[PDB]
A and B are shown apart, each in its own frame.
Chain A
Amino acid sequence: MEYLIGIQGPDYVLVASDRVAASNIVQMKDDHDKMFKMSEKILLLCVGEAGDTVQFAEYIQKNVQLYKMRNGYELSPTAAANFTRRNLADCLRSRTPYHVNLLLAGYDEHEGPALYYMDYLAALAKAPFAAHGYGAFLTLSILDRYYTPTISRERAVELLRKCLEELQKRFILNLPTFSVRIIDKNGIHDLDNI
């Protein structure tokens, strides 16, 4: 449905993002992912109303790149988050309905990575890990228990694996598993799923 999980290792960030591609009331295709890569330093995931997500995402991409070229500099991802939050804060008040939840996953060049969670009441927070949607219920107990501050790289991959097996086990939804992304300072890679 709508679900997004994240974990920040001290060397990369793995995120689980939603998939669809023919979803009405049936499953026949799932391949498309409601995420846009904000650049190559920041990546953004989102869930909410389906039309509003694309409309919101594109405006924010357009602006961030202008500032990059104009300054000839790059903003910190933290800097970006308050900016995004400020725009969404207006909207809520207005007649137009952007009230979507966003996850800004960012890597800081000489400050290390940072993970931001945005709510539909507009609230920006940093967490070493959090999650949202239906996914979150199952995942967060594992994350609390198995994770210990500054765990290895190798350990994360195993931990993410456990989630898929829980989701399978307990049984929820009707489409299978998640799409996982890796965000690093070597750019963005992909963690294949069964």
Chain B
Amino acid sequence: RFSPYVFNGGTILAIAGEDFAIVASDTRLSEGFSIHTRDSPKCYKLTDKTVIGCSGFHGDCLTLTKIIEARLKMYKHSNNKAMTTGAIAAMLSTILYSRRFFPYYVYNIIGGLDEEGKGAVYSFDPVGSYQRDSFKAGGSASAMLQPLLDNQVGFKNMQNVEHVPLSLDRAMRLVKDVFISAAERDVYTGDALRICIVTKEGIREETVSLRKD
């Protein structure tokens, strides 16, 4: 019969500061050898300095997003008080644990800022589960990019001589550099790159285009 599983995911990269975060993503979305669309990110601004991205399938991605947004509205109505990141982190999991019967899935990540004046990023598995991050790349191209990303951004491996502390500017240079490189190693990366930069002033977006061939 008809499929109960179709791929569509891209590639994303979430980078955590200690007072900022950026979540960057390709616009190219593909499956296999035919191209679904040459545009659209899977990173979205949930608001209030929470940025979210759901990689796996477009059909699932829109639906989760819409649905979360009502639970936040309802909550505030129920008495003035808002979900923290952590709250949201539990909320996604329950949904997934339900969906363990459902045959379509997604690999979700949430990022934002705490009131500890630093980033928190939590990442979920497609069955439920959560873990604390420092940095996460998600999607297809992730597996290849990440050790190198971990080392260049991090310096927390047992295979580097020194540390340096993050800078925003420096984080931006690294991010573009990884993506431009990713593109001639995948057909799931390409076209353009959408950067969500998260600060305590508010949420800014930057776009730069990449190669295609």
Q: Direct contact between A and B in the complex (CB less than 8 angstroms)?
A: no
Interface residues of B (CB under 8 A from A): none
Interface residues of A (CB under 8 A from B): none
